[PDB]
Amino acid sequence: AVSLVESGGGTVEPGSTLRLSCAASGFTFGSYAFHWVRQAPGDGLEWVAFISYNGSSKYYASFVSGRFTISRDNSSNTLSLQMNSLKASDTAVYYCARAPDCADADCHKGAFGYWGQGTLVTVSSASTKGPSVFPLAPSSKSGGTAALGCLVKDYFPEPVTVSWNSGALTSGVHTFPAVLQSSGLYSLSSVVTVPSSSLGTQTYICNVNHKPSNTKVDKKVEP
Amino acid sequence: DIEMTQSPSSLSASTGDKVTITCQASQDIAKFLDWYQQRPGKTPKLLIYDASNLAIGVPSRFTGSGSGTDFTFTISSLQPEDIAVYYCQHYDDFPISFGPGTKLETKRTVAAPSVFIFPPSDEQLKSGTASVVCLLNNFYPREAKVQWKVDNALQSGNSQESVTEQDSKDSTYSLSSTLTLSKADYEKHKVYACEVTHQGLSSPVTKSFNR
């Protein structure tokens, strides 16, 4: 089967460089043109670059301005995007893509039938940092429906994952998209609604994982 | 560079509805025009290529038509898994570009949020910052406003919020807002309030606590 596996994602300081790769298998790599496409968090798809089947033609989006170089190695079944002089606005998930199957020597239809899995590139002066996990509970100063939660604060880069009670609690859970703070660090909340009566009998623990910083926290949330 | 546009920007629909959305190019792009679906948090998927051809593996409820500058994409009978953003994309020349997308959501009746306020934790207050959080739970439509107040003074510039993806079961949204204060500012003042306005509320709802 066509397989496109990306690597090289990570964090980069402004003005510095990062190289992405896409390893292809399951077809004749050198018979296909390839593209890079990116998507900033919460924004639209944005075309970045094209390389022809044999690498003789390369084209770039207007925002590239000579900073990125697409290349390929047809003997090793790899595609590359070398990105230089990166800026915060280049933060995105980057995808490689290829046309639908075709029988010709050069399959270059500008339709993206097969995509890589995507890899995140985050450009910031921030350094990799694990979150602090704080409880969200109602003021101590009974009766109705209560909300409780965890505030997963000041981490970099995305993403974090949150579960409740090791996945045993899923009903009424809302885990929100992170916001990017003025500090350059992310913060996210996760909440659950429960009857206020359960605050005395039940245990609520939020399980937070931030893989980039090797941070795993289990936080008991108590009234 | 060719400019691709899409209308509407967002569309509310019901399962079973016929959905028709449009795409326009700033010059004649013949039929060099494709359509993609992207479900929240997923990889995009080609549905229609060369204006009207059904992509391999894709079911018949999807179609596209048009040529030149004006194109249409249709779903004959919307299914729940079809709630997504749809993008058009030209390949008339280089540079290639996408349109900005049309986002679908599911219609439901108006629902006012339940509202909850959370003080900063004692854990957080051991350091120099205080975060106050307000939750707006299970509401529709997505538009809502939060106004933070500290000792009855309206806050500006020191909050951020986000909204969940529409719930797949009940078609509601939820919203979380965080007010960020220095510990000193938090300890200086007493009354913390979040005031919520929404179509489902006849007047604003305020939840508050006293530090």
Closest CA to A7 of A23, A31, A25, A27: A23
* Secondary structure tally for chain A: helices H, strands E: 0, 19
Its sign, for the CA torsion A220, B132, B189, B128, is positive
Tokens representing residue A77 in the block: 């079944």
Among candidate residues B90, B107, B124, the one where a domain is terminated: B107
Among candidate residues B72, B107, B142, the one where a domain is terminated: B107
Omega into B141 within 30° of 0, i.e. cis? yes
Task: Check A112 against B34: CB less than 8 A apart.
Answer: yes
Q: Nearest chain B residue to A182 by CA: give it.
A: B158
Q: Are B121 and B54 in the same domain?
A: no
Q: Are B103 and B205 in the same domain?
A: no
Name the B residues in 135-174 with CB < 8 Å from any A CB.
135, 137, 160-164, 174
Q: Which residues of B touch A137 (CB under 8 A)?
A: 118, 121
Its sign, for the CA torsion B144, B149, B155, B158, is negative
Q: How far apart are CA A45 and CA B100, in angstroms?
A: 8
Q: Are B99 and B160 in the same domain?
A: no
> What SS3 class is residue B38?
strand
> What SS3 class is residue B20?
strand
Chain breaks in chain B (C to N over 2.5 A) after: none
CA atoms within 13 A on the CB side of A218: 7
Residues 6+ apart with CB under 8 A from A18: A8, A10, A12, A83, A86, A121
Q: How far apart are CA A93 and CA A120, in angstroms?
A: 4
What CA dihedral angle connects A161, A166, A172 and A174, to 10 degrees? Answer: -10
Q: Residue type at B61?
A: R
Q: Are B76 and B143 in the same domain?
A: no
Q: Are B128 and B175 in the same domain?
A: yes
Q: Which residues of A touch B180 (CB under 8 A)?
A: 181
Q: Residue type at B162?
A: S
Question: Do strands B33-38 and B45-49 pair parallel, antiparallel, or not at all (unpaired)?
Answer: antiparallel
Beta strands in chain B (DSSP E): 4-7, 10-13, 19-25, 33-38, 45-49, 53-54, 62-67, 70-75, 85-90, 97-98, 102-106, 114-118, 129-139, 145-150, 153-154, 159-163, 173-182, 191-197, 205-210
Q: How far apart are CA B146 and CA B198, in angstroms?
A: 9
Residues 6+ apart with CB under 8 A from B90: A110, B2, B4, B25, B29, B32, B33, B96, B97
Q: Are B71 and B13 in the same domain?
A: yes
- The residue whose two tokens read 């090289």 is A8
Nearest-CA distance A35 → chain B (Å): 10
| CATH number for B159 | 2.60.40.10
Domain count, chain B: 2
Q: Residue type at A80?
A: S
User: Residue B165 CB: number of other CB atoms within 10 A?
Assistant: 15
Task: Check B44 against A115: CB less than 8 A apart.
Answer: yes
Q: How far apart are CA B6 and CA A64, in angstroms?
A: 24
Q: Which residues of B touch A141 (CB under 8 A)?
A: 209-210
Q: Which domains does chain A have, with CATH numbers?
A: 1-126 (2.60.40.10), 127-223 (2.60.40.10)
Tokens representing residue A181 in the block: 């703070």
Q: Are B126 and B70 in the same domain?
A: no
Q: Are B96 and B114 in the same domain?
A: no
Residues 6+ apart with CB under 8 A from A150: A133, A134, A135, A136, A162, A189, A190, A206, A208, A219, A221
Q: Are B145 and B76 in the same domain?
A: no
Q: Are B44 and B90 in the same domain?
A: yes
Q: How far apart are CA A135 and CA A192, in angstroms?
A: 12
Whole-Å CA distances, A135 to A48, A95, A189, A197, A214: 42, 37, 10, 18, 21
Whole-Å CA distances, A14 to A49, A125, B97, B126: 21, 6, 26, 32
CA atoms within 13 A on the CB side of A90: 27
Cβ neighbourhood burial of B83 (10 Å; 0-12, 13-18, 19+) = buried
The span from the first CA to the last CA of chain A, in angstroms, equals: 53
Q: Are B27 and B120 in the same domain?
A: no
Q: Nearest chain B residue to A180 by CA: give it.
A: B160
User: Residue B116 CB: number of other CB atoms within 10 A?
Assistant: 23
Residue A21 and residue A7 in contact, taking contact as beta carbons nearer than 8 Å: yes
Tokens representing residue B185 in the block: 């500012």
Tokens representing residue B69 in the block: 């500058």
> Which candidate in B54, B102, B116, B191 is best for mutational testing of the A interface (most A CBs within 10 A)?
B116
Closest CA to B85 of B17, B37, B18: B37
Among candidate residues B85, B107, B129, the one where a domain is terminated: B107
Q: Are B69 and B27 in the same domain?
A: yes
- The residue whose two tokens read 């540079």 is B95
Domain that holds residue B121: 108-211
